[PDB]
Structure 1
Amino acid sequence: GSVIKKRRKRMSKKKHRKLLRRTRVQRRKLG
């Protein structure tokens, strides 16, 4: 079940990218 180790990383990276896309503007570009 080595793919599980990839899925956890995938979900964490996906949520981080989703947060960055939620804030690619003065929400975060100012900061």
Structure 2
Amino acid sequence: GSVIKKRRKRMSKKKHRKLLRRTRVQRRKLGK
């Protein structure tokens, strides 16, 4: 295939994981 597709997917996943890390304590507070 072409690596542009994997590149788009990796960037989206990277941004989501960064967001998850940024809001860990808040999410634990709300979910509990």
TM range (shorter): 0.7 to 0.9
Bigger radius of gyration among the two: 2
Aligned residues: 31
- Sequence identity, in percent? 100
Q: Which runs of 5+ in 1 are unaligned?
A: none
RMSD: 2.0
Greater relative contact order (Cα 8 A, min sep 6): structure 1 or 2?
Answer: 1
Task: Could you list the structure 1 runs, at least 4 aligned residues long, displaced by more than 3 angstroms after superposition.
Answer: none
- Structure-2-length-normalised TM-score: 0.75
**Structure with higher helix content:** 2
